[PDB]
Structure formats: structure tokens, C-alpha cells
Design a protein around this ligand. Structure first.
Ligand SMILES: *[C@@H]1O[C@H](CO)[C@@H](O[C@@H]2O[C@H](CO)[C@@H](O[C@@H]3O[C@H](CO)[C@@H](O)[C@H](O)[C@@H]3O)[C@H](O)[C@H]2NC(C)=O)[C@H](O)[C@H]1NC(C)=O
Ligand SMILES: CC(=O)N[C@@H]1[C@@H](O)[C@H](O)[C@@H](CO)O[C@H]1O
Ligand SMILES: [Ca+2]
Lengths: 97, 738
């Protein structure tokens, strides 16, 4: 069984690191490795400052060689906003560093 | 004395050994006392405010926790519930969204099953907060939230109770009547282009409910902040009752509450939802429940009501704007779903069900645990003269992961009423496109005296804060359709009048040209303006604590410079002076809340003017001054043959419902009569308050305040920040009927 990022609207990241669309999610919670679209530890969309446009890619980059830690640190938090109601980087609102 | 838990037959479930055991409940409130004797299973209290105390100085968090899980002297639904206390408000009910983000992260970390949020907010564009709430529900958190205590005004829903993934809880009294404070109306995220969803989800007891006191005993409180904990405790007890816990997800729980709810007679679905919480029937439904998809509303009956107001307040004809029903899809098979195919609209030939064409828009992925299905229903060309009930059913196959897809095929009955198209006059196009409002930007109150509510935030839709006005129009025969697109995107030959009220938006040059052509062709304009003044705007700047920022108005009460840009093609204009006071018109009382005047009007206008108070001087230098002959209203028929009409009025509060003092529904009826039939209204053309229409000569024209930021929230102007210019005219929306 795999601990998958339950949140994902489109993507899913398992404790291993695979990022897979929602159509390629297995029964045991693991991602479909066989499909080419499932690349693990994919930092796609992650800017050099440590912010990513997707929460699941934020988790996968954060899992680069901790799953709950990466899940929590990639959620938009207090430090992710300015004036309490606007992101300091909307296009990269999910940051792992 | 009353026992809320006992009244809902929570005892009948306590006899079964189900008492909220092994169910985690989080309370997002002002905190709890360390050793309150009314609770046996308070696991942790956390403070997310800047005040160094977990305790409850106001007594609100204590009351909420008691209603949910009290055991002594006034029992809660789930005495064995695991209480989690989140002190995210201060003693004054002040909470920062960043504190909410941290607290919600904590809640997801602790894997709470039920989360009560008794105090929400009007700011649904607080994107970090809404993203956090979606993240929360997606993680299997049944979020019960109060819809707000801003009723009985429509458009007063509070975030996050207005989200598809959150159980919105309204308030009834112990007599099963919707509480006056309880928020109502559709969601307003989807304006102007779209239509709002159905809220609240359910309504429970929220007036006089006894709950734990700060130190002990019990006390009675009121508010949807009271109804919400009742539903949260009932949901906690229900979760404890169910045998297979995997079947318990936000969607399945919401569906059990939706199906088991007892419909309140005489209450529309946007006040009550599906009905009042029924705990025993909910237990039975959860007992028999199997993973499935369902629809809120589960049927589309534009006839059966008052439950289906506003959908029964008018029938649908040919040439009408598509009737959009935003149906919330509750998918209990998985957090992510998928509509398998273009939903199959199967009409009923035997009973004339082919007179309706149903277009479908919907989520590409149904998430989190739910989604939307906007059904756009339109009559056909043949039925343009066919009265009757068109009946069909829309078959939606929602599929969810497992290997085989979890196919749930759901019937959505669609029983709509159809009539032949009304004449031009009966059809009124309410301008929603050019409305700008809070949450996004600071658009000040249309009445400067109302210090309590310094924002225009109730949607300004005919079903939200103009609900009384829309109901009045419906009772007057007018069919009120909504323009959610620029002027270029509506057949002006359909409507006799276009009603633009408290318009804060700019105008495309193409929009202005198209509107001028429409007016020459026969389209009419009723522009209920509102106050504008650079100096008053500067003095009315306020400190927003939610953002800890000094907000200046992005425009005044109405975007008078933009309205003047639109009106210059007809030589008309608006002033910048603030005026206010009681007055009368044709033996009817009135109240000029906070409006401007008509700086420029052509000579042939049937104008009316009266004396008011120079509220601008009051705002600036706190002095007093009565102004003689301030033009507030103006009528003008375009000289071009077959031309339109233009009515200018300076304040929008006499139609709004927010904090009404007087009523001008009579005057709006008269003005719609003028703009749709030509017959002059004697109330203004034979009035003794007529005068020479102004000229605007020598009077400095109002200008956009230097450094304004309206372009940041404008669908028309680009966020250029330097000499902002209108965007290119957008393409008109289109639908592929299925
Ligand atoms: C029914 O209610 C739902 C929930 O409020 C409405 O959903 C919203 O619909 C708009 C469509 O304009 C979505 O816009 C988004 O735009 C971005 C732009 O890049 C696009 O990438 C997204 O895929 C999406 O299309 C918006 O996200 C969506 N919100 C949610 C929470 O799903 C819906 O419009 C209503 N139905 C109507 C008005 O017919
Ligand atoms: C336009 C502006 O900036 N301030 C105006 C001022 O010009 C005007 O004399 C006064 C009376 O209403 O109201 C304020
Ligand atoms: Ca407005």
C-alpha cells in the first residue's frame, strides 16, 4: 500500500515520489509507473527559489533524494501570503523551501 | 429547559451505544477553558491568535463545544466525540487568514473527521483560504460551516459555508422557522457570467439553543454560529453510528443529511437547502447507503415551489437567456470523479419533453469529493409559442477510480415550465456584467452613514440584495433576465430596457458603440448611479484589519467617471458632490442615502430636483450645509426615431436591500414603465420639482482618483498600472446544446 497525496485534483504523489494523473492511480494507492507520464521526483514547474505551481509537484520535488512533512510544507501557509489574503507568488504558491 | 440533543432524538441513538465515539471533531472558535466540567474528551486546545491564552474570554468557543459534545446539564449530540479546540479568533472575534491557514494545516495533520467553523467571512476571493478549505475537504474532513448571521438579506453567504465541499448550515428556531439572522441566497462566485449554487445545505436549530457556559451552567445563544455546531454534533453522532467507516466521506455524509432532511414547508431551497436535519432518518439512510453519485437539487422542477424559488418565479420562453441550474454533484465513490460522457439528455416525447434543449457544462474532474454540473436549459424555436410542462431526464454517469470504474448513473429529472416569448417590454435585462464588488477590491458602501457595513459585497444580483426588488418586478409582470456579458453579447431587440444599477465597471469602446446602436434601435437604459467624490473617497479610506492595510476606494459609490464616459455620447454626465437626506416624490417618501448629482444633462430632459444635505462637507470638515436644487434624477428620450430612453439616478440604496431606510420600488417600477412603454411618468413630469436641466458648464468634471486601482479588478481595463486601457472586446459565450 502507498500513502498518496489525497488532495490532488489532477495529480497524485505517493510516498515513493511518483506523480501520476488521477486516471493512473492504482488500488493500493500507488501511481502507475508503467505509464510514461508517471515520473518520480519531478520538479516540473518548480522555480529556483523553491516554489512550484502544483502542490503534488511541490511534494515530489520535496521528496527528492518525510512524506507528511512534504505534504505539510507544500500547503499554502502563513508565510505564503502577504496582507493575509494574497499570495506573494500566485503562480508558485506551493513552496518547499 | 430545552435540550437540543434530546429534541433531535440523539437519545434514541445513545441507547444503541453510538455516542460519537472514535470521531474527531475540531472547533474553530474563540477557545475553551482548561478544565471545563461539561466535557470528558477534550484532547487538545491550540491558540493561533497573537493573544497569549488558550482560554475563552467571550464564551463562544465554549458554547460551540458544549452544543457539539456537552454531557452535563445541557447535553451535546456526541458526548464521546473527541473534541479539538482551535483558538483562531481573539476575544473580539478577530482572525487573520494566515492563522486560518496554519490552523487548517494542523487540522489536516490531526485527521479530524468533522470540523465546525461557526464564524466565516464574506471574502470568498481569499484564494489561500479557499484553496486551504478545498485541501481540507479533499483530505476526508467533513466541514460543517455556518452560512453567516447576516440574514434575512440574500447574498449574505459566508465563506467557506458556500463551497460545494462544505456543509452549509443555516438556522431555524425551535419552531422550525428559518431564523432571521440566517444567511440566504445563492452563491455569488459565478457572477456575472454564471449562476450560483444552492445553499445552505441544511438548516438546524440556531436560536435559543442552550450550551455550555464559560465556567459552567448553560446559556442560550443565537446565530448560524449556533446552528452549525448542532449539525456538526449530529454529523459526529452519525459518523459514530455507521458500521463501515470507509463509506463515510464528505460526499456520503452530505448525501445522507440531504436525503434524510425534512423539507420545511413554505421555505425555498436557497433558505433551507434540502430541509431540517433529521437524525434518525439520516441514521437509516446511512445504514442503507452505498457509494453513489447524487445531485443537489436532485431534480430540476422549475414548477414545484416555493422550494424551487427563484426557478419557479418565472417560466422559460424562447429568446430568453439560458436558464442555468448549477447542480452540485455529490460523488460518494471517490474524492476525484469524472463525467463519463456528455450527459445524456433524454427527453419525454409522450409529454412534449423535446421542447427543451439542455446544454451541459461541468468539471473536467469532480474534486474534491464533489463538483458542479451547470445545466443550461433553453426552449427551442418550435416551442416559441408552446405553453406547457417540458419533461425529461438527464442521465449523468459519474465514474470514479476503483479496476473497473465505479459507474454511478444518476437520473436528474428536468420538469420545466414553458411559455411563448413575452413582448419586448416585459423582458428586463439586469446588468450584472458591469458590477464590481468586494471580495476582490474595496468598493465602498453606497450609503456613507452605514459605518457598520463599509463594503458593497452582497453580489448586487436580482437574487442577492436585490431579491426584494426582483420579487417586486416578478409580481409586476416583468421577466428579469441577467446580462452576464458585455453589451455586445445580447440581442437588444429582445429587451425593452437595460437596468444598470450601482455600476462600478468601466466600458469597452465597442461596448459603448454597441449600446449606442441599441439605444437608437430601441433599447432603453435605467442607470441607478451612486455617489462619487475624490475627496470623500479619500476621507472614507479605512483600515482593513484582515489585511492590516489602509484601503482607499477603487471607485466611489459608482464609477462616475466611467458612467460619464458612457454617457458623453448622449451629452449627459454626473457630478461629484455628495448629497443626502429624506425627501418625497409624487406623495411617496424617499431617502437619498449617498449619491451624486447630474452635472450635465441635455436641455430636453424631464428633470426633477430637490434640496438635500451636502454630505461631502460633513465627511471632510464635519460641517453642515443644505444644498438648493440638487438634480438627482433625469429623464431623456433619444431624438432619433425608434430611439431608446435614458434615466439617470444618483443613488442605488433605494433598491438595494442591505440597510434600507425607505423604498423606491415604486420609482423603479415607474422608471421601467418609462423605459419600456414610452408613456411619461406623471410622478416626475408633472412634479413641482422640475427645473431647467443642467449644462455642466463651469462645473469641473469628476475625474478618476489619482493612483486608483480599479483596473486591478476590472473585466474591461487591463492591469497595466500606467494609463490603463480597455482590453480587446471578449468573444461572446456560446453553448452546444445536448
Ligand atoms: C457552478 O459552480 C461552480 C463552482 O462555483 C463554478 O465553477 C467554476 O467555473 C469556472 C468557469 O468559468 C471555472 O473557471 C476556471 O478558470 C480557469 C482559468 O484558467 C481554468 O483553468 C479552470 O479549469 C476553470 O475553468 C472555475 O474554476 C470553477 N470553480 C470551481 C470551484 O470548480 C461553475 O462556473 C458554475 N457553473 C456555471 C456558472 O454555469
Ligand atoms: C471633487 C473633490 O475632490 N472634492 C469635492 C469638492 O470639489 C466639492 O466642492 C465638495 C462639495 O460637495 O465635495 C468634495
Ligand atoms: Ca454594484
Amino acid at each position: 500500500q502507498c500513502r498518496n497525496s489525497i488532495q490532488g485534483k489532477h495529480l497524485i504523489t505517493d510516498e515513493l515520489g511518483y506523480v501520476c494523473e488521477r486516471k493512473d492511480l492504482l488500488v493500493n494507492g500507488c501511481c502507475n509507473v508503467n505509464v510514461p507520464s508517471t515520473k518520480q521526483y519531478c520538479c516540473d514547474g518548480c522555480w529556483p527559489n523553491g516554489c512550484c505551481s502544483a502542490y503534488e509537484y511541490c511534494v515530489s520535488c520535496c521528496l527528492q533524494p518525510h512524506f507528511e512533512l512534504c505534504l505539510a510544507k507544500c500547503r499554502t501557509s502563513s508565510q505564503s501570503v502577504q496582507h493575509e489574503n494574497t499570495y506573494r507568488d500566485p503562480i508558485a504558491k506551493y513552496c518547499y523551501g | 429547559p430545552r435540550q437540543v440533543a434530546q429534541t433531535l432524538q440523539a437519545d434514541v441513538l445513545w441507547q444503541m451505544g453510538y455516542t460519537g465515539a472514535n470521531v474527531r471533531v475540531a472547533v474553530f472558535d474563540t477557545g475553551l477553558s482548561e478544565k471545563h466540567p461539561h466535557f470528558k474528551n477534550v484532547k487538545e486546545r491550540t491558540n493561533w491568535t497573537n493573544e497569549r491564552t488558550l482560554d475563552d474570554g467571550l464564551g463562544h468557543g465554549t458554547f460551540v463545544a458544549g452544543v457539539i459534545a456537552s454531557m452535563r446539564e445541557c447535553q451535546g449530540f456526541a458526548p464521546d466525540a473527541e473534541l479539538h479546540i482551535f483558538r483562531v479568533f481573539t476575544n473580539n472575534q478577530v482572525s487573520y487568514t494566515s492563522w486560518f491557514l496554519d490552523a487548517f494545516n494542523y487540522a489536516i495533520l490531526k485527521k479530524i473527521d468533522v470540523l465546525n467553523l461557526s464564524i466565516g467571512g464574506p471574502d470568498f476571493m481569499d484564494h489561500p483560504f479557499v484553496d486551504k478549505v478545498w485541501e481540507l475537504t479533499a483530505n476526508n474532513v467533513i466541514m460543517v460551516s455556518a452560512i453567516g448571521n447576516d440574514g434575512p438579506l440574500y447574498g449574505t453567504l459566508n465563506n467557506p459555508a458556500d463551497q460545494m465541499d462544505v456543509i452549509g448550515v443555516g438556522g431555524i428556531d425551535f419552531e422550525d422557522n428559518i431564523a432571521r439572522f440566517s444567511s440566504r441566497g445563492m452563491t455569488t462566485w459565478e457572477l456575472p457570467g454564471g449562476y450560483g449554487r444552492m445553499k445552505p445545505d441544511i438548516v438546524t436549530y440556531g436560536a435559543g439553543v442552550r450550551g455550555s457556559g464559560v465556567k459552567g451552567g448553560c446559556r442560550a445563544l443565537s446565530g448560524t454560529s449556533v446552528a452549525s455546531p448542532v449539525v456538526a454534533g449530529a454529523v459526529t453522532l452519525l459518523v459514530s453510528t455507521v458500521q463501515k467507516r470507509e463509506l463515510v466521506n464528505p460526499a456520503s455524509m452530505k448525501q445522507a443529511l440531504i436525503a434524510s432532511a425534512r423539507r420545511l414547508p413554505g421555505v425555498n431551497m436557497f433558505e433551507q437547502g434540502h430541509g431540517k436535519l433529521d437524525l434518525l432518518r439520516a441514521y437509516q439512510i446511512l445504514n442503507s447507503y452505498k457509494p453513489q453519485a447524487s445531485l443537489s437539487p436532485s431534480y430540476i422542477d422549475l414548477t414545484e415551489c416555493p422550494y424551487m424559488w427563484p426557478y419557479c418565479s418565472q417560466p422559460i420562453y424562447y429568446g430568453g437567456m439560458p436558464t442555468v441550474v448549477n447542480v452540485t454533484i455529490l460523488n460518494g465513490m471517490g474524492v476525484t470523479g469524472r463525467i463519463v460522457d456528455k450527459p445524456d439528455w433524454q427527453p419525454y416525447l409522450p409529454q412534449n419533453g423535446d421542447n427543451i434543449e439542455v446544454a451541459f457544462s461541468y468539471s473536467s474532474v469532480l474534486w474534491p469529493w464533489s463538483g458542479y454540473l451547470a445545466i443550461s436549459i433553453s426552449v427551442t424555436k418550435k416551442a416559441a409559442s408552446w405553453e406547457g410542462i417540458a419533461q425529461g431526464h438527464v442521465m449523468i454517469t459519474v465514474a470514479s477510480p476503483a479496476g473497473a470504474e465505479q459507474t454511478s448513473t444518476v437520473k436528474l429529472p428536468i420538469k420545466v415550465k414553458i411559455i411563448p416569448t413575452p413582448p419586448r417590454s416585459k423582458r428586463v435585462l439586469w446588468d450584472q456584467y458591469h458590477n464590481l464588488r468586494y471580495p476582490p477590491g474595496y468598493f465602498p458602501r453606497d450609503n456613507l452613514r452605514m459605518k457598520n457595513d463599509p463594503l458593497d459585497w452582497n453580489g448586487d444580483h436580482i437574487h442577492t440584495n436585490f431579491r426584494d426588488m426582483y420579487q417586486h418586478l416578478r409580481s409586476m409582470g416583468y421577466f428579469v433576465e441577467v446580462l452576464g456579458a458585455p453589451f455586445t453579447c445580447f440581442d437588444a431587440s429582445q429587451y425593452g430596457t437595460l437596468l444598470m444599477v450601482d455600476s462600478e465597471e468601466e466600458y469597452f469602446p465597442e461596448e459603448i458603440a454597441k449600446l449606442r446602436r441599441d439605444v437608437d434601435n430601441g433599447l432603453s437604459l435605467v442607470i441607478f448611479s451612486d455617489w462619487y467624490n475624490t475627496s470623500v473617497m479619500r476621507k472614507v479610506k479605512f483600515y482593513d484589519e484582515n489585511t492590516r492595510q489602509w484601503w482607499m476606494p477603487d471607485t466611489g459609490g459608482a464609477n462616475i467617471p466611467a458612467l460619464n464616459e458612457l454617457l458623453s455620447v448622449w451629452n449627459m454626465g454626473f457630478s461629484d458632490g455628495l448629497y443626502e437626506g429624506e425627501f418625497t416624490l409624487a406623495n411617496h417618501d424617499m431617502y437619498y442615502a449617498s449619491g451624486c448629482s447630474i452635472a450635465k444633462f441635455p436641455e430636453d430632459g424631464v428633470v426633477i430636483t430637490q434640496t438635500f444635505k451636502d454630505q461631502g462637507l460633513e465627511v471632510l470638515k464635519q460641517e453642515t450645509a443644505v444644498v438648493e436644487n440638487v438634480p438627482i434624477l433625469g429623464l431623456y428620450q433619444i431624438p432619433a426615431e425608434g430611439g431608446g430612453r435614458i434615466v439617470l439616478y444618483g443613488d442605488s440604496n433605494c433598491l438595494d436591500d442591505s440597510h434600507r431606510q425607505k423604498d423606491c420600488f415604486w420609482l423603479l417600477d415607474a422608471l421601467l414603465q418609462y423605459t419600456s412603454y414610452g408613456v411619461t411618468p406623471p410622478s416626475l413630469s408633472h412634479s413641482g420639482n422640475r427645473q431647467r436641466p443642467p449644462s455642466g458648464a463651469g462645473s469641473v468634471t469628476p475625474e478618476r482618483m489619482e493612483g486608483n486601482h480599479l483596473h486591478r479588478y476590472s473585466k474591461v481595463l487591463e492591469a497595466h498600472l500606467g494609463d490603463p486601457k480597455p482590453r480587446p472586446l471578449p468573444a461572446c459565450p456560446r453553448l452546444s446544446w445536448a
